[PDB]
Design a protein around this ligand. Structure first.
Ligand code: 0K5
Ligand code: 0K5
Lengths: 428, 428
């Protein structure tokens, strides 16, 4: 593969920090070296000395004097080596990517820890998009990506979707405006990428099937575009057995996958990871290097010590317990919607994630009902408008989270929603 | 002031997340509200439960069950409110900025916590720079900013400097190519900003005087450009009672200041802060929102609890102890340079920071001497080339850190240097 045609001139221009050259010759000269090249502050000046963090169904995490000095000090841009190696083994175990042993220039599998999955996505979008570029996605889409894409001046082409996610026939019809050979033509504008959330799409809750993923992949090869697999709900699927990912079928080295620990381990710690072809991951690490420098060393060490103690088994056992909690929350929100919203609204059972996407029946726009009227009654829900490229267009939809509210809180919230819908239905 | 000319079309296009409305309307409706809006995961699912962090010359920091849930959860893009309010009072106490009570559109003082000061600088550079824009700085300059600026396609105009930093007469002469009215002319290209490190410039160690800062400020008003005050060594000045900052004299609302906790509290925690005019800080927060989302909640809570317990007095007492350590390190490196490098090299006493900038006397380029020859002898130092826009140009300079090496380690390193200098002079 040739990755240069996908990236911007600014991304290609990025150079590594001069400290990398010193790090390369660190293991090339003697072992007991004196380093005056560095810019690392003296760790002994830092006021935090030791840390003890208690874990539920796990051994207490302890940072002694030496471990605390490491946790409070600068660390590599791509992430700490022990976290990177554990995550690489996890990706091999779960996805067995065809690119593991490819040459670096051919899209060899590479990983990098990011300050949440949002950072990975943001740096990936900025690395690729020139104004006027064509990108593909299915609307309604995650507001965070629409808000990232909007300032980049790309044309967002909406791909049709249903309860099983993106409709491959719709993607096929959209692509027919070009010929496969246009992808090699510098003056043709074939799509740079397809962006999708394959499990529990935010905000619909819909997931792609294996069959559809294979057809989509086949179209990505034919018209030579990348696939940005934003999969933060991969570890939050309600159905038994995880569906194979785009990364698992990536023979071409065309997939960039974002994984998140936000719903399973911690959202506040800002630790996610990106998996993709080495030349593209390298461009992302270089942009991260001049922005955050690296993700928090302390937070990485907390997560790394937890994952190593748990092992792959302990991690999977924890995700099962988390899925079980969200599955019970999903049943409770579905029972509340059946009770108060039957005949007033329409909804599908979410396949993954923490959201219920609700279509209000006899209202063109739910925005004032949700942003004003519901808030004054003490109930917060998100209007559907936020999940479309054209947010000014009227939306009869709303997104309801089932992550934390109790069944009684859901009962009160849905009773309020029903009351407001009824009020709106009476106004001619 | 009109800030529109200092912001790219992409930066201006940024919109806030839809949850901001849900955060603003939250404080106007009832008190016992039910939220199904936020995409916040259930905190009870997180595996870390409590934390105890020991502090030197301070009370032990403790995160109980409720505080840990907050620390592991999403938090506002600009930072946690208790940290923002403590830092705002610190900025008022230290700098008393003239912009505190200005209307928001006139450059009202605003702050935001960033994932290290590097993130603030990066977002500020990206917010301002269009390809072809002219920017001002004094070389040698921090490699991290040169590496951020390089992909942006701006023309970097070098301003002359000496032991007292930027020479105002040099800035005055450079600016004379334009007329003050050209800053209002869309087709004239007057500099967008002046970037400088006023205390302990990386890599020189030189600091600006009050008199020079006032003259520079006067030129920034005359030609209407911004001042990016990157001041990470503000709390590492060797002289007592700190020089007034550019922020302290910012009557026009033209200063963007970056502060860092990297040398005083922790580099690894990735917590810094930006202070500047509200319309510009707002553009930065919106870019942070689509990238990192927010700085680590856990790390912010650690620092906030430490600062609140210390108070402004406890913080200043800690910085005095840190300065005292670096002052002794500076004396030790100066004594090592006097012993070994007299007649072979030239250096100035650093006014702040942790670096000694050394000019080798009879060599045009020190790169092979430092990257190859010194490394094989077990001594690492940084070649000067990394601190110039044109890094390919020969440099007789080197940067030596005095943050951690012992006096004996400095003696061994400076012996090795003196040996290699003598070797490269006796070569026919
Ligand atoms: C004038 C000015 N402005 C802003 C800042 C950013 O500071 P921050 O974001 O922490 O607040 C600085 C701090 N510069 C240095 C940082 C530094 C970091 C290192 O670890 C890395 C380096 C790269 C990637 C990962 C980890 C090693 C050596 C370093 N050396 O040598 C430095 O000189 C500065 O000097
Ligand atoms: C498909 C997809 N891709 C990637 C990601 C990024 O995930 P991350 O970076 O944590 O790995 C997500 C995560 N989704 C949400 C995050 C979210 C965060 C909030 O707190 C903020 C929000 C803004 C600023 C500061 C704090 C509030 C509401 C939120 N809502 O409503 C969400 O839906 C995602 O759904």
């Amino acid at each position: 593969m040739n990755y240069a045609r996908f990236i911007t001139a600014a991304s290609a221009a990025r150079n590594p920090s001069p400290i990398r050259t010193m790090t390369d010759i660190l293991s090339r000269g003697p072992k007991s070296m004196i380093s005056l090249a560095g810019g690392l502050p003296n760790p002994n000046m830092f006021p935090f000395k030791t840390a003890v963090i208690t874990v539920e169904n796990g051994k207490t995490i302890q940072f002694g004097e030496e471990m605390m000095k490491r946790a409070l000090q600068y660390s590599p841009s791509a992430g700490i080596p022990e976290l990177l190696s554990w995550l690489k083994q996890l990706q091999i175990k779960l996805h067995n990517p065809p690119t593991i042993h490819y040459p670096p220039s051919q899209g060899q599998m590479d990983l990098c820890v990011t300050s949440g999955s949002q950072q990975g996505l943001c740096k990936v979008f900025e690395m690729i998009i020139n104004p006027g570029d064509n990108v593909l996605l299915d609307e309604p889409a995650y507001s965070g990506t629409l808000q990232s894409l909007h300032p980049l001046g790309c044309n967002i082409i909406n791909v049709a979707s249903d309860e099983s996610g993106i409709v491959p026939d719709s993607l096929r019809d959209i692509l027919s405006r070009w010929k496969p050979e246009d992808a090699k033509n510098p003056q043709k504008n074939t799509p740079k990428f397809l962006y999708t959330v394959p499990n529990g799409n935010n905000p619909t809750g819909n997931s792609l099937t294996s069959e559809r993923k294979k057809e989509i992949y086949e179209l990505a090869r034919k018209y030579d575009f990348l696939i940005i697999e934003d999969d933060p709900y991969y570890f939050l699927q309600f159905n038994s057995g995880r569906v194979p990912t785009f990364l698992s079928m990536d023979v071409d080295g065309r997939v960039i996958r974002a994984d998140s620990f936000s719903k399973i381990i911690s959202s506040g710690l800002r630790i996610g990871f990106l998996t993709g072809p080495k030349p593209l991951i390298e461009r992302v690490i270089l942009h991260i290097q001049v922005s955050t420098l690296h993700p928090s060393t302390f937070n990485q060490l907390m997560i790394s010590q937890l994952l190593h103690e748990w092992g792959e088994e302990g991690f999977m056992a924890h995700v099962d317990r988390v899925i079980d909690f969200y599955s019970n929350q999903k049943d409770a929100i579905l029972a509340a919607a059946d009770k108060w919203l039957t005949g007033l609204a329409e909804w599908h059972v979410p396949a993954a994630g923490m959201f219920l996407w609700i279509k209000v029946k006899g209202i063109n726009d739910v925005k004032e009902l949700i942003e004003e009227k519901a808030v004054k009654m003490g109930v917060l829900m998100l209007p559907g408008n936020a999940f479309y490229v054209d947010s000014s267009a009227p939306s009869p939809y709303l997104r309801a989270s089932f992550s934390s509210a109790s069944p009684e809180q859901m009962d009160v919230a849905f009773q309020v929603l029903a009351q407001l819908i009824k009020e709106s239905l009476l106004v001619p």
